């Protein structure tokens, strides 16, 4: 693992992409290295630290949701339209059909936990939309503010049972949602 010397570490950091160029870290590794940074530019690194701290506190101020809240047709108008300025929702319309509702329900809890920044709401099709066809068993109709932003209706759109944990992140984010910490379009396979 870390049984590698200075030359080996330089070789690895050069081979990975190019270099970390002492400008692209979070509050963790720029804080832990803490000694490779040369001392003639303390003001620049401290200004960067203060701006990143401001960014972190701003992000934590708007991270207040944490988990999905499920609603009925009564308040559906308010959480589909009056959810807030600069916030978009998920609106997973689900039933007790086992496969796709079950998988998506288990995955959305994890996504909401790891994204406390975006609203997750799930509703049952019977009492949210009058006489929904119910053949298109999944339904995540993403609303940007109150308008259409994306739509996933068919199990073929997701791909059926073969759904992993985090490719849903990319599927939601491709429409313009919060950025991803993951690469590759269809999460490899």
């Amino acid at each position: 693992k870390e049984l590698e010397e200075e030359a080996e570490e330089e070789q690895r950091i050069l081979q990975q992409s190019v270099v970390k160029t002492y400008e692209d870290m979070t509050l963790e590794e720029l804080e832990d290295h803490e000694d490779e940074f040369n001392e003639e530019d303390e003001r620049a690194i401290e200004m960067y630290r203060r701006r990143r701290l401001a960014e972190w506190k701003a992000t934590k101020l708007k991270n207040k949701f944490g988990e999905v809240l499920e609603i009925s047709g009564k308040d559906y108008v308010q959480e589909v339209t009056k959810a807030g300025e600069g916030l978009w929702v998920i609106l997973h319309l689900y039933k007790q059909g086992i496969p796709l509702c079950a998988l998506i329900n288990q995955h959305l809890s994890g996504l909401a936990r790891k994204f406390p920044d975006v609203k997750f709401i799930k509703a049952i099709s019977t009492t949210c939309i009058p006489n929904y066809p119910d053949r298109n068993l999944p339904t995540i109709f993403v609303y940007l503010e109150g308008d259409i932003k994306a739509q996933f209706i068919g199990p073929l759109v997701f791909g059926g049972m073969n759904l992993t944990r985090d490719e849903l992140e990319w599927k939601l984010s491709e429409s313009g949602a919060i950025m991803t910490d993951l690469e590759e379009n269809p999460k490899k396979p």
Partner: protein, 524 residues
């Protein structure tokens, strides 16, 4: 349209490709033919990343060369193999392989199947190993004079030869300071515990191996003493500040006296950890992770010098030197884990950097080479030569045998197996003698490099090298003359020579068994 194989697949077959393979090896043997001998010539290599490598050894030349011909790729892999296994004889093995293929091509043309050539090559390899073991002489390990002579023989053909009388000593010291006895058996000699570090600028002979460890760190706090006479060093792996943990805690506060109580709990935890460290009375604490402000304050109140994050290899060599032991949980920091024996700890300033020395320690098992020179490339070449000398010293301490140098042993084994082949009969005798005169290139290479005429000199050498136990007679490449290597006094470990011969013959077999090439397709 209609295809069987891929569109991009190309195929080559027949003697054509065989010739190509041989030629490829010769080309690889042609780049670094002038780098062999005490009169070698430096070569400059331009890295794709902007660096420059100014070197002599063959491996450092080939590792910077990319070849799309797969036979040359095999030759480069052979060079890396010889560099890693023994650390010496790269140019010798590459030249030997090149000339063995070059002489096997002649038999390939004369409608001879490669299999008989391979069999003769293997027989020649076995016989040359036998007769190379025959002419060997023992070496006295306890004798330091002969050790210095062997390292001089290994270093006379590099750029630091002018400082050989220094450099050899350095290598010897390091190799005789890492020598360790493991649990019961398993004597070891590892270069992970022999670090060479380059500090540009200064004087080359100012370089020396320190009786201890040097790292490029600084004291955590200004008030902590930068000069410790007899340190008691404790080595830490974990961190000395407060960390969240692993599970999700999410402490809930409803009272007025829980927030400040939480913060005071963090402070008291740091205080308790530092008091656990302090109670056993250390003097220097080395940690691989960060140090909290409270941590260094509490350590300082007990007059302890704290060195912040240190790479794990440096901590391992520090532990091996001082005799200490790394502990992650401070509450289990035992008395036996405290490092006593470090003769002096000094935070010196070199150029515009702070360097910490734990030198003067008793009977260390790890060393650091203060290698001071003039430039980064000069120091890189110096440390490469030091690594070669270290590898040769380890080879001769693990093998008490020696063999004459300057192409004397090669000519001796060539003549021995030539006289062996003169009695047998068959079709395999011709490749046998082909290998016999194939081992002859390196003396010829030395004579060519020194600037003398190879024809008459090598003819005289071969003629005189036939009678009256003259197997130690070789060429002096400084004066380009024929000398008896006993008076000249250049000897090489038997391991290096036998490994060179084995690797050359095996590379010849590998590139001679091949007759078809299919190029261009998906990985799998």
């Amino acid at each position: 349209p209609v295809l069987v194989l891929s569109q991009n697949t190309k195929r080559e077959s027949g003697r054509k490709v065989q010739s190509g393979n041989i030629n490829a090896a010769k080309t690889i043997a042609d780049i670094i033919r002038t780098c062999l001998g005490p009169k070698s010539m430096m070569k400059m290599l331009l890295d794709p990343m902007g660096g420059i490598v100014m070197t002599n050894d063959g491996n450092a030349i080939l590792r910077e060369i990319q070849v799309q011909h797969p036979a040359a790729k095999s030759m480069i892999e052979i060079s890396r193999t010889q560099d890693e296994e023994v650390g010496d004889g790269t140019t010798s093995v590459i030249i030997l392989a090149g000339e063995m293929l070059s002489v096997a091509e002649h038999f390939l043309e004369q409608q001879m199947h490669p299999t008989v050539v391979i069999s003769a090559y293997r027989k020649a390899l076995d016989d040359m190993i036998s007769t190379l073991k025959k002419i060997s002489i023992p070496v006295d390990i306890s004798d330091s004079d002969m050790m210095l002579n062997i390292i001089n023989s290994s270093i006379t053909t590099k750029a630091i030869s002018r400082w050989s009388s220094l450099a050899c000593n350095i290598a010897l010291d390091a190799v005789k300071m890492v020598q360790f006895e493991e649990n019961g058996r398993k004597e070891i000699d590892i270069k992970k515990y022999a670090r060479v570090e380059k500090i540009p600028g200064g004087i080359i002979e100012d370089s020396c191996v320190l009786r201890g460890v040097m790292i490029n760190k600084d004291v955590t706090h200004p008030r902590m003493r930068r000069y410790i006479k007899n340190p008691r060093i404790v080595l830490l792996d974990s961190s000395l500040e407060y960390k969240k943990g692993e599970s999700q805690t999410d402490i809930e506060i409803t009272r007025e006296e829980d927030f400040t109580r939480i913060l005071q709990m963090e402070e008291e935890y740091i205080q308790q950890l530092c008091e656990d460290i302090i109670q056993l009375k250390p003097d220097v604490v080395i940690t691989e992770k960060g140090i909290s402000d409270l941590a260094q304050h509490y350590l300082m109140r007990a007059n302890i010098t704290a060195i912040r994050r240190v790479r794990k290899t440096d901590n391992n060599r520090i532990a091996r030197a001082c005799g200490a032991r790394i502990v992650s949980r401070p509450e289990e920091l035992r008395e036996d884990d405290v490092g006593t024996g470090a003769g002096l700890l000094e935070i010196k300033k070199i150029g515009d950097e702070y360097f910490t020395f734990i030198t003067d320690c008793k009977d260390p098992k790890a060393c650091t080479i203060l290698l001071r020179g003039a430039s980064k490339e000069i120091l890189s070449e110096v440390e490469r030569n030091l690594q070669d000398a270290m590898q040769v010293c380890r080879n001769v301490l693990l093998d008490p045998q020696l063999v004459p140098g300057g192409g004397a042993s090669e000519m001796a084994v060539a003549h021995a197996l030539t006289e062996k082949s003169k009695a047998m009969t068959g079709v395999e005798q011709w490749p046998y003698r082909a290998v016999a005169q194939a081992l002859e290139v390196i003396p010829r290479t030395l004579i060519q490099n020194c600037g003398a005429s190879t024809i008459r000199l090598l003819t005289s050498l071969r003629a005189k090298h036939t009678q009256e136990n003259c197997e130690t007679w070789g060429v002096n490449g400084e004066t380009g003359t024929l000398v008896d290597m006993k008076e000249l006094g250049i000897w090489e470990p038997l391991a290096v020579k036998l490994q060179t011969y084995k690797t050359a013959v095996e590379t010849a077999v590998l590139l001679l068994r091949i007759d078809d090439i299919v190029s261009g397709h998906k990985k799998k």
